[PDB]
Ligand binder design. Structure first.
Ligand SMILES: CC(C)(Oc1ccc(CCNC(=O)c2ccc(Cl)cc2)cc1)C(=O)O
Ligand SMILES: CCCCCCCCO[C@@H]1O[C@H](CO)[C@@H](O)[C@H](O)[C@H]1O
Length: 257
């Protein structure tokens, strides 16, 4: 039962995310992606080696590739969530509310899967963008990406696997305290089932792990703070970078944060 619940969640995760952490870990270790570390390699990646609104400048261009990637992850997360029968039993507007406030927490948790201390995979693992290059970007674009790295490196210490991640992200999305939910008790009851499924699953999958479940609850709290700070950087970019186009779906997500 609690196993059939988790296994259903794990299959919805494999069914919907192109890049698993297993796939990613193969590539980052070497079982190779074109490395983008400066303007020249970026241009080469675009010419066809690895790959939008009208061009503006390099730092805005990278930001657009960020937007394109996160919009795609939002689409996958939505399909993943609709593939959870309990999620799909909420009223559609509550489903949207959960996604609105949950996807970025889930995106920054999943980002850890494709990152190491030196950069991150792009374009389905065919490119690799260095943390160095990202840091070099014009402000404020260089400050938005670096904190995700700090979180991702500590997060990867936990050494979760894809079966853990599927339950963790389900728990991030099925969150009872999002503003404007209609049926708080029903969502709270679903979240509780996922959390018990998670503790159960971690018991068997990480038998020697001390304090992993509470450590993961703290990561959920950490992700909430990451996304609050991220949304503050986005609102500032909206005010001061008026030439930078902002994808409409992402504008709706950030409207009231
Ligand atoms: C997209 C946007 C506006 O801001 C964000 C900025 C950065 C990241 C981290 C993920 N970045 C990437 O996946 C990424 C994609 C392509 C390139 Cl060339 C570099 C980095 C996530 C989100 C968002 O908040 O949705
Ligand atoms: C502003 C609110 C208008 C949107 C109304 C859509 C509500 C219907 O939403 C439906 O509810 C069902 C459970 O009742 C779910 O199983 C379905 O997935 C969902 O589509």
């Amino acid at each position: 039962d609690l196993k059939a619940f988790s296994k259903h969640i794990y299959n919805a995760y494999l069914k919907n995310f192109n890049m698993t952490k297993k796939k990613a870990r193969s590539i980052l270790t070497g079982k190779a992606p074109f490395v983008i570390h400066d303007i020249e390699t970026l241009w080469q990646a675009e010419k066809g080696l690895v790959w939008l609104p009208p061009y503006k400048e390099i730092s805005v261009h990278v930001f657009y590739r960020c937007q394109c990637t996160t919009v795609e992850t939002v689409r996958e997360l939505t399909e993943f969530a609709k593939s959870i029968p309990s999620f799909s039993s909420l009223f559609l507007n509550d489903q949207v509310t959960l996604l609105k406030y949950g996807v970025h927490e889930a995106i920054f948790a999943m980002l850890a899967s494709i990152v190491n201390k030196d950069g991150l995979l792009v374009a389905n693992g065919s490119g690799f963008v260095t943390r160095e290059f990202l840091r070099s970007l014009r402000k404020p674009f260089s400050d938005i990406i670096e904190p995700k790295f700090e979180f991702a490196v500590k997060f990867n210490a936990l050494e979760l696997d894809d079966s853990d991640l599927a339950l963790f992200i389900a728990a991030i999305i099925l969150c009872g305290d999002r503003p404007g939910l209609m049926n708080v008790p029903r969502v709270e009851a679903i979240q509780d089932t996922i959390l018990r499924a998670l503790e159960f699953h971690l018991q068997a999958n990480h038998p020697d792990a001390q304090y992993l479940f509470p450590k993961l609850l703290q990561k959920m709290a950490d992700l909430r703070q990451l996304v609050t700070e991220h949304a503050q950087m986005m609102q500032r970019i909206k005010k001061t970078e008026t030439e930078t186009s902002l994808h409409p779906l992402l504008q709706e997500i950030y409207k009231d944060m």
